[PDB]
């Protein structure tokens, strides 16, 4: 063969069984376009940054009339099953089919399938699922065979497969995938590109944004994840948000999958997450979109404009530039930095908008060990992305917005840090609320309320201590039975804490009709629970305020005492290092010959004496006077020693600054003794002071105050969207 | 060559420069015995258990008159310097020289160097120090060259080098080693045997006890360690302990090296360990030897009788037989099991005796991070070896002792467990002593004693919490500067605690001459410190009660709060597992040809269709109805999950059972509130109760009581030895 400009570009045909299916579609089975009956293979053996410099090309450039690209759909995966992968492909194909049948459109039409380009980017050739790859092979986009790993002393970086198929999935069952090819199917051009070795996930986005997108030059770049299934017309609704030239990014809403006939609602750990997803798409995202800055939830469905993300925003996302705090830990925020660098771009004005008429369902974990490992990634990233934004809020004023937008963004950057500070102090708030409430009901009614207030404290301190020891030196998959018991214990504590307040409040009412507990039934149940229901009704989805609202309350104590403790003890996921310097000089003959053969035996007396004097000389030049610097750690074992130091300094500052709040309200830590000894000179300790009644009201005023802003923000968004709908109708 | 019975046995000569030195010794430089001018090499390529079964042999068996062995000295090492190795060899050579000049002896004499056989067992061929091996090469016991790694599809297990040298070291300086060969030097038979791959240290003892010792068949087997230097005649004095046939093992005493002209006494961390070594060889070892059961200190100098340790004692030391508590953690006790299985041997009667006229000096750590990592091995082994002995104390009565010895051993097995229980509860004892003493001086004199009692509690709780976080998820070599600060803080706390007691006691005396603090200067300073001095004077080494007694007191709080915390959080030294299943099918050509060459390209349409059909068939047979058992952990990654579970269960039971003692004396943990609420029905909390004065005397009575037994035991041993000396004179 004659390789093309130093590159191995091969062109193979397809199976005979597959071509016959395509032949039935046309009205004359004699000829077919070359794009429908071939599969271009090529090896890259270079970097994604210099893909266009090494005379590399894609299949879209070399046409009689060059094709333009309007949407580039990226779909990353890593050893997912062949059922999770099919769900995303089925959702993608239906949207493309929908966008073809549009009658009146200046962009889309009956020949609009030449714009969308699907791009699957797998990770690792030895880690991809065996069954998932067979699904791609059944679509005509994979052929076993050519896997050249090197070309002229150049290891290949990644393999590129590409083909324009005409088979789209019809129905995904629980154990089967239905494939069909009829007159009502649209062709989908695939660009399956498989990587060689495992390189995390940020490198996968580097192969797309800096790689193929640099050759195709699309308008919009949409990000997906294997498992997420877009809706019937979710692709089209998200594309309509770029009508005005100010938007530089968008995302829809994400929903949980309830199985078949709503069967997955009996699980207390699935119904709990069904209420948390709803309350995040109704109270938080709308309020963030009002100002003009949003952060996409993990697993969601997002799209960026390729003109906005080009240059500085992409330079500080991939590389980001030692061992400095804001440069070495910045990978923990995932892509939340990309959303922040777009709004604050110099001499430009881009805003992020939240679309509501585009949804994407997904599955959720149903076991406890698997559910803890997932939130570990979310919490560590949502905590660092708000500390980075607050310390760099001055960069908004160097942008190109007007005067109103800058002031509106500065307020939101403070309102987010206030929410972060509330969540940082939530470990010492729950204990104080639990302790000032059980004691206060024992000083008023006695009876059996005196022993129950001592059993629950010891049952709390034992479960809290065991979570710190099992998170610093153990895995959550080994000891699975203990976490379930801890969750049940916390749920029971929550039930008792709820009952005590109702009892005290009803007694207070009966003793004044026939105060800390008087306004406790007025602000924590009348102004917090009512606004949630009103906001849900306004959002026109009021069917989750009774379905799965009880289960979320019982698992509330396990969101701040089992999930925050594990997420802070595992920040960087270090691995130290073993290595080893095996003796390179080895394999001295094999003596395979049974006998006779003597090989080479040194008998040279002079050589023997030279060797003996060569070992005798080593003991001479030993003087340690010039003490050389000890062998410093490489670079891979010295960076690990830095991740272990910035992680032990966060656990200490999180425990010490939370115990100070407890030793100012409860007068623990030896402070009450100090007052008593000061009072015995000019001698006893009260059980409860007056500082436990001021604090018990402040921590409940902030809870209902933060639920008041989320209602005004949710209502303004709907009011504006209703007028937009009326005007555009 | 004609290999011997399936074994590669080669015989090389020595360097010409080395033979000339030997030639000067004899009175006729014409001939020399073959043992003095050759070096036998052999590869083992088998197991130590079956060394004699594969027709293997040593150089001592094939003589005109077979030689018998009286002492087999084992010297293990692992990447030690060439100065530490020379110190042991110089000490060994001087003892052999001393044992030759004895005039009247029925065993030793002028030709007694044929009995002692030195055996150096290095570990790892790629880990041995390159400079230390040159010292062996300069002795005529190593030749670079033949290092065959395989023979007829059989990997070599270990390499055997052996030669009878005649050069002994004269003086070891700080940077040089002096070698000489004169008329007053004795030959030493070396058996340097170098291992192939790193296999810990228990395997090294298996190569000796089950290996060479099975062919040489010695009388006594002495154990050493590179770095330990025996005394002038320490070998001979330890051999005299086997005169009577009841002894089945012995050991001497170990001392610290004070450098040159006592220069290493200025270090507070070296002087502290100088007083701990003395108090262990004067109060503990003598008392244990009185009963008849002793445990050798780490790094010491011990000897066993090969007849006593043969069979069951060696079968349960190496193998010891699942995942059971007393079978999987038994490797933590090192060789302390061997000492226990000798005394309780079935139908036999062996006792362990402690010799006092044989010493061996060694170096000690002088940095803090290096000192913490060493005691981590000692504490984890001395705690498990006493729990195993107490739960199996019934095995003494099945032995062959008389009636008195069984009763004497049963008492000692309880007295050791009592000492272990005292040390298990030492975390909550120091805090109680520190807290009941600083508060009590603030309720009597006020002034500045009210603020100092609150600063020290907060300064204690911050240093105690940071030691649990830095030991469960960090290495002690990284954060070196924090441990030094923690030690200084604890030392200052100790000084303040000492001053408070003296102040209170002198006030108590002055207020009765012109009670908890009255007998506090009578039992904790009059009956504890005096008995130490009396025992030291009786031992005839009373020069360490003022030299390094102050430094040991200041570092006393750091022996139970920095060393016990780190030793319990790191019990098994687990490493989890990474592994990885790299794609075995790989290496798809190299395409090295610049052009033209097409190699093999499949174009077979039928084969292509068959391939497409075999990838299409995988999606068919997928039915998950028969849910197979998930892939269980191998055996190496499942055992690690068991070591992590038995280690988190020890840290929890050590913290919970120590906080209960604090919540019964100080009435913390919510218990005082319970009493107050019970008292408000039929309402305040006292600062100090009467249980803090009963406990403060009990914990000081046990301290001076345990120092009273160690004096009687130390005196009885010396009284008996004096009569033995008088009778044997
Ligand atoms: C010997 C200890 C064994 C257990 C170790 C557990 C693990 C980690 C280290 C813990 C360090 C703190 C040990 C406190 C020991 C204790 O039981 O001491 C009590 C409680 O004292 C209080 O206030 C209670 C303080 C609770 C602290 C919880 C953790 C806080 C972390 C940050 C610590 C910062 C400094 C805190 C200093 C106290 C003193 O009671 P009292 O004599 O005043 O009772 C007077 C009644 N009339
Ligand atoms: C929110 C916590 C943040 C810090 C977490 C630190 C790390 C690990 C988990 C610690 C679990 C225990 C938390 C105790 C919280 C606390 O500050 O609570 C106090 C102290 O209470 C006491 O007694 C002091 C108890 C000290 C316990 C030290 C460790 C013991 C380990 C085993 C625990 C076994 C169960 C113990 C139950 C208490 C209640 O003070 P009060 O309202 O009675 O003061 C009345 C004055 N008139
Ligand atoms: C008569 C006053 C004392 C009554 C004590 C009753 C205790 C009942 C405890 C029941 C279990 C509580 C949860 C473990
Ligand atoms: C004088 C009476 C004292 C009674 C103390 C009762 C203490 C009960 C502790 C229960 C702990 C339960 C842990 C699971
Ligand atoms: C199979 C995984 C289940 C996870 C949730 C466990 C239950 C949590 C709530 C318990 C409530 C108990 C009320 C009595
Ligand atoms: C005079 C009425 C006394 C009522 C006492 C009730 C005690 C609490 C009972 C329920 C405890 C929590 C069970 C989960
Ligand atoms: C100095 C850089 C390394 C820090 C390692 C962690 C030190 C933790 C102990 C000190 C905590 C101080 C809290 C006020
Ligand atoms: C070599 C030592 C490196 C220490 C790095 C410490 C970085 C600062 C950590 C601050 C943590 C603050 C948490 C709120
Ligand atoms: C390292 C910082 C330590 C701060 C300690 C603060 C202790 C609490 C002081 C409370 C003062 C007011 C008491 C009523
Ligand atoms: C989550 C809010 C943290 C900061 C405020 C905490 C309370 C401060 C004390 C309030 C009570 C009054 C004490 C004098
Ligand atoms: C006049 C009564 C109060 C006096 C307070 C004096 C405090 C002195 C503290 C000195 C440092 C203590 C160790 C940090
Ligand atoms: C009403 C006056 C209260 C005074 C409280 C003083 C607390 C001092 C705490 C010192 C902590 C030092 C840690 C290193
Ligand atoms: C170089 C390593 C030193 C280790 C010991 C540090 C000092 C311990 C004792 C401090 C005493 C301080 C008295 C004021
Ligand atoms: C009436 C006399 C009062 C004396 C007060 C002494 C206070 C303690 C001083 C030393 C503190 C510890 C220093 C290391
Ligand atoms: C009374 C203390 C109970 C502690 C339970 C939590 C620790 C469990 C560790 C893992 C145990 C695995 C075998 C059951
Ligand atoms: C698979 C779970 C294994 C758990 C093993 C637990 C063994 C017993 C540990 C007891 C520790 C006692 C310390 C005093
Ligand atoms: C798991 C075991 C828990 C035991 C709790 C014991 C608490 C202390 C009881 C003290 C009773 C006497 C008080 C004066
Ligand atoms: C180290 C000894 C541990 C066992 C005994 C601990 C003290 C027991 C209580 C003594 C005081 C009296 C309480 C009623
Ligand atoms: C260079 C590192 C700076 C870290 C700044 C952290 C600020 C945290 C919030 C402080 C105010 C509550
Ligand atoms: C972010 C939440 C912080 C903690 C708020 C209070 C939790 C307990 C509420 C109990 C209601 C009965
Ligand atoms: C969550 C509530 C659990 C207990 C059931 C309600 C108890 C109400 C008591 C009212 C007394 C007047
Ligand atoms: C930032 C750590 C928590 C403490 C915040 C300040 C508390 C001041 C209390 C003053 C009481 C008089
Ligand atoms: C973050 C908001 C903190 C508000 C603290 C208010 C404290 C008020 C003390 C006096 C009440 C009468
Ligand atoms: C099978 C495991 C048995 C462990 C026994 C431990 C005993 C510890 C001492 C109990 C009495 C204080
Ligand atoms: C094994 C030792 C346990 C703790 C004994 C008491 C320690 C503090 C002594 C203070 C003397 C002034
Ligand atoms: C270890 C002692 C440090 C303080 C110096 C001695 C103080 C003695 C005070 C006596 C008062 C009567
Ligand atoms: C074994 C764990 C520590 C507790 C030992 C028993 C204490 C009993 C105290 C009884 C007080 C009335
Ligand atoms: C291990 C020895 C424990 C001894 C406990 C004695 C308790 C005595 C209580 C009554 C004193 C008057
Ligand atoms: C998943 C079946 C119900 C579990 C209930 C746990 C409390
Ligand atoms: C770059 C660090 C800025 C800190 C600001 C704290 C208000
Ligand atoms: C130029 C910086 C202006 C900050 C305004 C904060 C409200
Ligand atoms: C972007 C339209 C003006 C906003 C002004 C906010 C004060
Ligand atoms: C009144 C004391 C009761 C102790 C046992 C409660 C279960
Ligand atoms: C899946 C394991 C369930 C254990 C329940 C313990 C209460
Ligand atoms: C349309 C701008 C609204 C700003 C205030 C949002 C709460
Ligand atoms: C080793 C030189 C003296 C150190 C003293 C540390 C307190
Ligand atoms: C084999 C376990 C014996 C336990 C004895 C406890 C006294
Ligand atoms: C046969 C067991 C006898 C035990 C005696 C203990 C003193
Ligand atoms: C071994 C000599 C007899 C000892 C009896 C101890 C009671
Ligand atoms: C009397 C209060 C003093 C507080 C500061 C002590 C250093
Ligand atoms: C060797 C490092 C010494 C640090 C001293 C800090 C007080
Ligand atoms: C010679 C036996 C002595 C037994 C008692 C030792 C304290």
Curated annotation (Swiss-Prot), chains A, B:
Membrane-related topology note: Multi-pass membrane protein
Transmembrane segments: 413-433, 451-471, 484-504, 521-541, 549-569, 649-669, 699-719
Keywords: Cell membrane, Cell wall biogenesis/degradation, Glycosyltransferase, Membrane, Phosphoprotein, Transferase, Transmembrane, Transmembrane helix
Recorded phenotype for the gene knockout or disruption: Cell lysis during cytokinesis.
Protein localization: Cell membrane
Catalytic activity field: [(1->4)-N-acetyl-beta-D-glucosaminyl](n) + UDP-N-acetyl-alpha-D-glucosamine = [(1->4)-N-acetyl-beta-D-glucosaminyl](n+1) + UDP + H(+)
EC code(s) of this entry: 2.4.1.16
Superkingdom of origin organism: Eukaryota
Function as written in the Swiss-Prot or TrEMBL entry: Polymerizes chitin, a structural polymer of the cell wall and septum, by transferring the sugar moiety of UDP-GlcNAc to the non-reducing end of the growing chitin polymer. Required for mitotic division septum formation during adverse conditions.
Family, similarity comment: Belongs to the chitin synthase family.
Protein name stated in the entry: Chitin synthase 1
Species per Swiss-Prot/TrEMBL record: Saccharomyces cerevisiae (strain ATCC 204508 / S288c) (Baker's yeast)
Span of the entire protein shown here: 378 to 1131 of 1131
């Amino acid at each position: 063969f004659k390789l093309w400009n130093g590159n191995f570009v091969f062109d193979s045909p397809i199976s005979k069984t597959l071509l016959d299916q395509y032949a039935t579609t046309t009205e004359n089975a004699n000829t077919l376009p070359n794009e429908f009956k071939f599969m271009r293979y090529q090896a890259v053996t270079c970097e994604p940054n210099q893909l266009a410099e090494k005379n590399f090309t894609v299949r879209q450039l070399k046409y009689l009339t060059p094709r333009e690209t309007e949407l580039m759909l990226v779909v990353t995966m890593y050893n997912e099953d062949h059922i999770l992968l099919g769900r995303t492909l089925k959702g993608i194909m239906d949207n493309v089919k929908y966008m073809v049948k549009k009658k009146n459109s200046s962009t889309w039409g009956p020949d609009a399938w030449k714009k969308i380009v699907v791009c699957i980017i797998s990770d690792g050739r030895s880690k991809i699922n065996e069954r998932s790859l067979a699904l791609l092979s059944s679509l005509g986009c994979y052929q076993d065979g050519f896997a050249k790993d090197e070309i002229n002393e150049k290891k290949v970086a990644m393999h590129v497969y590409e083909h324009t198929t005409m088979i789209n999935i019809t129905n995904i069952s629980e154990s089967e995938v239905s494939l069909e090819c009829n007159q009502g199917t649209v062709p989908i051009q695939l660009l399956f590109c498989l990587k060689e070795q495992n390189q995390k996930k940020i490198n996968s986005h580097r192969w797309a944004f800096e790689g193929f997108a640099e050759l195709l030059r699309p308008n919009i770049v949409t990000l997906l994840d294997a498992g997420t299934m877009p809706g019937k017309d979710s692709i089209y609704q998200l594309w309509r948000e770029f009508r005005n030239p100010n938007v530089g990014g968008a995302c829809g809403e994400i929903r949980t999958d309830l199985g078949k006939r709503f069967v997955k609602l009996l699980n207390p750990l699935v119904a709990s997450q069904n209420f948390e997803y709803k309350m995040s798409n109704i109270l938080d995202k709308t309020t963030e979109s009002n100002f003009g800055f949003i952060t996409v939830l993990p697993g969601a469905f997002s799209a960026y404009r390729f003109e906005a993300v080009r240059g500085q925003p992409l330079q500080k996302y991939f590389y980001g530039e030692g061992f400095h705090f804001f440069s070495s830990n910045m990978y923990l925020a995932e892509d939340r930095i990309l959303c922040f660098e777009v709004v604050t771009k110099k001499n430009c004005n881009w805003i992020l908008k939240y679309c509501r008429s585009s949804y994407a369902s997904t599955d959720v974990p149903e076991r406890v060990p698997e559910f803890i490992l997932q939130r570990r990634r979310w919490l560590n990233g949502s905590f660092f992305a708000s500390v980075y934004s607050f310390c760099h809020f001055y960069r908004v004023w160097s942008s190109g917005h007007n005067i109103g937008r800058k002031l509106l963004l500065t307020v939101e950057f403070f309102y987010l840090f206030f929410n972060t500070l509330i969540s940082w102090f939530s470990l010492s708030s729950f204990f104080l609320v639990f302790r000032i409430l059980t004691v206060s009901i024992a000083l008023a009614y006695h009876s059996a309320f005196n022993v129950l207030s001592v059993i629950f404290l010891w049952l709390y301190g034992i479960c809290t201590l065991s979570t710190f020891i099992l998170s610093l030196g153990n895995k959550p998959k080994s000891t699975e039975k203990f976490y379930v018991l801890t969750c049940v214990i916390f749920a029971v504590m929550m039930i008792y804490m709820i009952f005590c307040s109702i009892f005290m409040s009803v007694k207070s009412f009966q003793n004044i009709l026939k105060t800390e507990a008087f306004r406790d039934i007025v602000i924590s149940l009348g102004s917090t629970y009512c606004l949630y229901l009103i906001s849900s009704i306004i959002y026109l989805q009021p069917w989750h305020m009774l379905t799965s609202f009880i289960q979320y309350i019982l698992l509330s104590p396990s969101y701040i005492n089992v999930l925050n403790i594990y997420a802070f003890c595992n920040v960087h996921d270090l691995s130290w290092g073993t290595k080893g310097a095996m003796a390179n000089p080895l394999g001295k003959i094999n003596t395979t010959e049974d006998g006779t053969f003597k090989m080479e035996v040194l008998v040279s007396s002079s050589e023997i004496q030279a060797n003996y004097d060569k070992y005798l000389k080593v003991l001479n030049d030993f003087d340690p006077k010039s003490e050389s610097r000890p062998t410093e750690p490489s670079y891979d074992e010295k960076k690990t020693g830095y991740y272990a130091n910035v992680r032990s300094l966060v656990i200490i500052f999180w425990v010490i600054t939370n115990f100070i709040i407890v030793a100012v309200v409860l007068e623990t830590g030896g402070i009450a003794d100090y007052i008593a000894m000061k009072s015995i000179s000019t001698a006893e300790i009260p059980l409860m002071t007056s500082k436990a009644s001021i604090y018990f009201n402040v921590i409940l005023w902030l809870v209902a105050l933060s639920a008041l802003i989320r209602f005004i923000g949710c209502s303004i968004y709907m009011i504006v969207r209703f007028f937009k709908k009326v005007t555009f109708r």
